[PDB]
Amino acid sequence: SMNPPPPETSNPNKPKRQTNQLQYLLRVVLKTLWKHQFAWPFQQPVDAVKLNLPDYYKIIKTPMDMGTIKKRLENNYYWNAQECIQDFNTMFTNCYIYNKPGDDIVLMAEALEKLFLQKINELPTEE
Ligand SMILES: CN1CC[C@H](c2c(O)cc(O)c3c(=O)cc(-c4ccccc4Cl)oc23)[C@H](O)C1
């Protein structure tokens, strides 16, 4: 099987806005997670071909990853901060769905998720 196309990251027909929460999600949340020692599996769409995971996209029907999230932020694709938060949550839950408790890849995701939740708890109030 080939890989699916990646999630959309730009749509010139969508309206765009700047908000302090979206700025924070890029400047603080995405950039901090990106540097984490276990970030690398989550920095781009899961390449099921290269990883030899022929059933990945039979099980995961709503793919998400931090490369896509980053591009969405940088393209002003999100109108609401909640959309971006949902995408991070989709990324983590996809890993937990595909895999099993205690797998190394799951514990990697859990470490990123703990950091994510700390940074989301520090999300600024809307201006
Ligand atoms: C050797 N083994 C390691 C785990 C890997 C694997 C899984 O078993 C299950 C997964 O859900 C993922 C994933 O989401 C991302 C990456 C990944 C992606 C890019 C670079 C490195 C890695 Cl580890 O790998 C995954 C695959 O079985 C090959």
Side-chain angles (χ1 to χ4, degrees):
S1 296
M2 64 193 286
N3 291 317
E8 185 181 57
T9 50
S10 181
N11 181 345
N13 296 320
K14 297 177 68 173
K16 295 179 159 205
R17 66 178 178 182
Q18 169 186 311
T19 75
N20 67 301
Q21 289 185 342
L22 286 168
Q23 289 172 321
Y24 176 89
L25 281 163
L26 178 58
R27 172 204 333 114
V28 175
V29 181
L30 186 283
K31 298 318 172 59
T32 302
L33 295 167
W34 198 272
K35 293 181 182 190
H36 194 280
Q37 61 180 341
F38 306 142
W40 99 98
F42 307 102
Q43 285 176 347
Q44 58 285 308
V46 171
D47 186 340
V49 179
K50 196 185 286 186
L51 294 165
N52 191 20
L53 298 174
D55 65 339
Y56 188 84
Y57 291 110
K58 300 183 186 196
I59 288 161
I60 299 304
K61 303 305 195 180
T62 307
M64 190 50 58
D65 66 278
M66 297 200 296
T68 297
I69 292 166
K70 177 193 76 82
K71 284 178 162 176
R72 283 178 171 199
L73 288 160
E74 292 163 337
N75 275 285
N76 302 118
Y77 184 83
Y78 301 123
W79 186 258
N80 291 330
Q82 168 182 92
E83 291 176 90
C84 174
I85 295 168
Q86 287 171 343
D87 281 349
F88 276 105
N89 284 326
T90 294
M91 178 183 80
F92 296 124
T93 57
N94 286 344
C95 187
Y96 305 153
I97 288 166
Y98 183 70
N99 298 291
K100 298 304 193 293
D103 289 343
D104 289 333
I105 190 67
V106 166
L107 278 298
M108 286 182 185
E110 288 183 2
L112 271 192
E113 186 184 18
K114 179 175 177 173
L115 182 54
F116 171 73
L117 292 171
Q118 286 168 345
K119 298 304 184 188
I120 293 303
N121 283 339
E122 298 169 0
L123 187 70
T125 294
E126 282 189 359
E127 286 178 4

